[PDB]
Subunit: 208 residues, 3 copies
Amino acid sequence: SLRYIVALTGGIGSGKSTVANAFADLGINVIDADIIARQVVEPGAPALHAIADHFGANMIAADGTLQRRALRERIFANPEEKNWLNALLHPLIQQETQHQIQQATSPYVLWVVPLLVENSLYKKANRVLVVDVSPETQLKRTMQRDDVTREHVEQILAAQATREARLAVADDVIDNNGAPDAIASDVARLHAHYLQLASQFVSQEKPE
Amino acid sequence: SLRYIVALTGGIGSGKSTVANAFADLGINVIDADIIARQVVEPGAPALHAIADHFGANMIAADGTLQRRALRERIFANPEEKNWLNALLHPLIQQETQHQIQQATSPYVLWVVPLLVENSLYKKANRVLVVDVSPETQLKRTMQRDDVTREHVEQILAAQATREARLAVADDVIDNNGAPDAIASDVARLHAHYLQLASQFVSQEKPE
Amino acid sequence: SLRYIVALTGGIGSGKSTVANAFADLGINVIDADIIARQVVEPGAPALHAIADHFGANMIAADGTLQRRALRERIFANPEEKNWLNALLHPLIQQETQHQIQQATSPYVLWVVPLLVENSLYKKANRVLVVDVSPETQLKRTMQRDDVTREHVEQILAAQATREARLAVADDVIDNNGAPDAIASDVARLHAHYLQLASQFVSQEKPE
C-alpha cells in the first residue's frame, strides 16, 4: 500500500524530539533517522563488524559501540573511504526506513530527518513540517542540554543548513521557542490536517 | 543558437508521452531523456566499450547491444558500481542532449525528463511543466498498461519523487487523470505562452 | 559571533564582481568562492596533500604549490577523476568558507558563489541575491571579454543553470544589463535592508 509521509526537520536545539513526541502521543508512527542510524551500527551489528574489518580495531570502543570520532578522522579528505562507508550504511538505512514505513499502522507516518534540507530528502516526503526557533534559542537550549559553550554551538549552527533554507522547503511551520506545551494548539491542527490529507491522497484528482 | 527549453516531467503512469506527443502535434521537437540514454549505449558507442571493460565482455549481447537486465542485476547490490555507471553516462547524455537541442528547428524544444526532480535537472530548464495525476491513476494505468501488480508500481512510486515534490518545482501543471483528448486544450494554451516566452527570452531585460 | 550570510550569484557575463565591489565600497567583507577554492589547495592544506597522495607527487610544483597544469591533464586523461576532485574539495571548501565568515568583521558578509544554483549552495546562505541580465548581455559581454564566438558562448550558457533557475531561488534580484554605476541605488537599498536583518536574525522569534 502507499503510505503518506510527513517529514519533520529542524536545526540543533529546535526541539525536534519534543514535537515528534507530541505526534507519537496521538498514535502516529514516528520514523527516526538518527535512531535508525544508531541501530544500524549498534554492538554486534553486522555493519559494525564490516566497519571494524575495513578500518581497524580502533573503530570499536571498550563498551562495544562505534567510535564515531575515530571513523570520522579516517574518512577525512578521503572521498574513496567516505564512498566506501556510505555504500555500506546508506542501503541498510534506506531499507530499515522503508521497512518501518511499510510496517506502520498509523494513517500517516512522521519521518524525522535532521538532514532533510542537506540531503534533499524533502523530495521523498509528501509534506514537510519544520520546527522553527531563533538561532538564540538553538544556542541556549544546546548550551544547556549538552553542557557546551556558545562558540561550540555556533560552530555547529554554521555547519547545518540555515533557518531560511529550512523555511524555503516547508509546507508547515511550528514555532518552538517556548515551553513544550505551547506547541499543542499547532500540533492538534496539523494532526487533523494530516489525517485528512492521508485519507484522500491516493485518489485526490486535483492537488492542494 | 540558444533554444528555449521547456522541461516536461511526471511520475510513472502519469502519461508523459501523451502530453509530449500533443506538443509534437503543434510542431514542437521533443527530446526524450530515455531515448538519449539508449542512444549513448548503442553498439559502437564509447560508453559501451567502457562498460564492457569495467564490467566484462558478458555485458555485451550477441548482436553487440547492452545486456541491460544483467547490468542492472550486477549493480543492484553495489552502490559504488551504480555510481560508477552514472558518472560515465552523465557527460555523454548531456553532450547528446545538447546536440539534439541544437538540431531542433521548432521555436522551442520540449525536453522530457522522467528523473527531473530526482536528478535536480529543473536547474537546466527555462520552464518546467509537470503532468499531474492521482497516485490511484499512476497505479491503475501502469497496472492496466504494463500488466503488472499493484505492489509492483507501489515500489516504483516509493523509488520516485513524490507528487508534491514535483508540484513544488512546476511553473505549469497539466492534469492527465482523464482521456488523452481532454489534454488538447491545455496543451494549446501552454504552447501559445511558450511561443511568446521563446520569442522574447534572449533579449528580455527584466524577468517575467 | 554568528554572522549573517548573503549569497551573490549570476551567470557568466552578469558582472558579479561589479556588484561585489559595490558592497565592498559600503564596508562589507566579500568572501569569494573562486578565491576560497585556491586557498584550500595552498601549501599545508589537506586538499593539497590528498591531491598529491591520489595523483602522485608530480601534482606539486617546484615552489610547493599545486601544479594546476599537471592536475588539469590527469582529469582530461580520466574524466571521472573530476568527480573524485569535486568530492574532495566540497567539504573542505565549506569548512574554509565557514572559517572566513567567522573571521569577518562586517555585520553580514557577501558570499560570491558562481555555482550557487548548480551546486545548491544556497542551503548555506541566510539570503540569496541574484545579479540578473538578459542572455544577450551574457553573450555580448563574454564575446568582448574573451574574443570568442557567439556559438562558443551559447555552449557555456547551455552548460550553466538557466536564468529562470536562478530567479527561482532569489530572495532579491538586481539588474546589471547596463553601466557599472547604474546599480548604486539598488545596492544602497539592499545594504540598508541587510544591515537590519543582520542586526536582528539571531534573536528573531518569528521568521521574516
